[PDB]
Write a protein that binds this ligand. Structure first.
Ligand code: B12
Ligand SMILES: [C-]#N
Ligand SMILES: [Cl-]
Ligand SMILES: [Cl-]
Ligand SMILES: [Cl-]
Length: 405
């Protein structure tokens, strides 16, 4: 297949996998990450049988959190649980261990997932003058998660996805893989053709989204795009050119330490191993992988570093706020935030996610329903990394902007 990463440097892949390894010891409820597990299982690498314990931890945690009694004893909260999108990833995790969800606990979780989709269907509405409470990405992911377990969703639920496609890249890829799975599973035969046409659309929109550099959307959307596109069934001259161009671009960024985010790597590794989430229909748990070993040697400087002077600014709220910080080069945006909070009038709140700390509130102003704290480098360039991974450059002005999407 022309859209497959045929050639990759084994030491690059091993470095990437090396970045996920420490996470296999991070088993608290907020650190646990079904996406990392799936990434590794679909990869050419293995993280010890640290893996089995990880999955087992996922099972105990996702069950005890999501299956808690009819009403909790006088709290209405105590210990915030995984979301439904995360449940969908947990289901992908099970398949990656060649397990089908089952038992009474299994049924209850499948139900929770289906209820989620049903509720998103209702939020979207009638004839689509309305948004999903979460997003089309999780909508698609839910469908794909149930599909790989041979679980059928309502024709009306799939309809909502089809319609949204029929009338960015990351969402397209994920919607695509859901459709791709529905087709190969024949779980909604009553819309067999409608789905086939939706795939062609998805392929079209992704190629249209290709940048001068070769990425589909951006470097980080590229692996998911490739996950869907290696699924072929529409081999094309335009598609071959696009895929070759996309691949060169991806391999180039790999030489430059572009992927640092654990979730990103977990989406990349399957691709560098010619696998996608659609392979979870029938996973191959017999294939051997290369054992990753503790890196265990992070090089010591004993030098005085460079410092960077960076300007922090906050907009989209009254009043606006600015802050001057000089910190050691290589410091993350999150470090700069904690610094400003520690040594000044700044304050912020993040909440946990599978991509790490998601900035939810700045200066006591929390983003509401269709708002979010956008992060940009001046002038007006939205960052492509979150606070924990983005390491600002010298001279930069970094903007936390409350936006209405
Ligand atoms: C939906 C989405 C959003 C929504 C989320 C709200 C919503 N409606 O649910 C919005 C628009 C707010 C958003 C914002 C951002 N996003 Co976004 N987002 C996505 C998308 C398409 C799906 C994530 C998802 O639902 N995952 C599924 C569920 C199961 O996982 P989850 O961990 O529970 O998802 C939560 C987090 O993903 C959080 N979230 C969304 N984006 C990001 C980005 C980061 C860095 C973090 C830590 C969290 C986060 O929202 C979800 C919960 O509401 C992904 C695509 C992808 N390829 O993964 C990108 C993606 C994760 N986002 C990305 C980016 C860059 C951002 C921003 C930094 C953009 C910016 N410059 O301001 C911000 C985050 C800033 C902040 N406040 O901390 C990148 C991350 C790349 C990287 N190297 O880490 C991705 C991969 C897209 C891309 N190709 O660039 N995003
Ligand atoms: C996120 N986009
Ligand atoms: Cl239930
Ligand atoms: Cl990254
Ligand atoms: Cl705050």
């Amino acid at each position: 297949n022309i859209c497959e990463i045929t050639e990759v440097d084994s030491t690059l892949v091993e470095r990437l996998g090396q970045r996920l390894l420490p996470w296999m010891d991070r088993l608290s409820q907020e650190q646990l990450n079904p996406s990392i597990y799936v990434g590794l299982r679909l990869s050419s690498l293995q993280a010890g049988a640290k893996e089995a314990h990880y999955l087992h931890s996922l099972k105990l945690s996702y069950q005890q959190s999501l299956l808690r009694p009819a009403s909790n004893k006088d709290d209405n909260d105590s210990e915030a649980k995984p979301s439904m999108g995360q449940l969908a990833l947990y289901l992908l995790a099970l398949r990656a261990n060649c397990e089908f969800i089952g038992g009474r606990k299994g049924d209850r979780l499948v139900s929770q997932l289906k209820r989620f989709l049903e509720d998103e269907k209702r939020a979207i509405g009638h004839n689509h003058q309305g948004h999903p409470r979460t997003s089309y990405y999780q909508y698609s992911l839910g469908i794909l998660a149930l599909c790989v377990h041979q679980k059928r969703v309502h024709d009306s639920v799939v309809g909502k996805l089809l319609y949204a496609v029929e009338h960015s890249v990351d969402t397209m890829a994920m919607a695509g893989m859901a459709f791709s799975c529905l087709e190969l599973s024949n779980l909604n035969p009553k819309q067999r053709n409608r789905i086939n046409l939706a795939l062609k659309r998805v392929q079209e929109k992704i190629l249209k989204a290709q940048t001068p550099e070769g990425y589909f959307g951006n470097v980080y959307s590229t692996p998911l795009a490739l996950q869907l596109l290696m699924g072929s069934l529409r081999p094309s001259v335009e598609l071959g050119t696009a895929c070759l161009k996309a691949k060169a671009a991806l391999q180039a960024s790999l030489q430059h330490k572009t992927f640092q985010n654990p979730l990103m790597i977990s989406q990349l590794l399957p691709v560098l191993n010619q696998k996608s989430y659609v392979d979870l229909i029938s996973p191959d748990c017999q294939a051997p992988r290369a054992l990753l070993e503790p890196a265990l040697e992070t090089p010591p400087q004993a030098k005085v570093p460079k410092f960077i002077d960076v300007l922090l600014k906050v907009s989209g709220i009254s009043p606006s706020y600015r802050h001057s910080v000089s910190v050691p080069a290589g410091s993350s945006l999150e470090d700069i935030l904690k610094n400003a909070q520690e040594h000044g009038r700044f304050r912020f709140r993040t909440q946990a996610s599978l991509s790490g700390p998601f900035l939810t509130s700045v200066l006591g102003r929390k983003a509401g329903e269709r708002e979010f704290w956008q992060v940009l480098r001046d002038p007006d360039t939205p960052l492509q990394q979150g606070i924990a991974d983005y390491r600002p450059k010298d001279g930069e002005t970094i903007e936390l902007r409350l936006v209405g999407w």
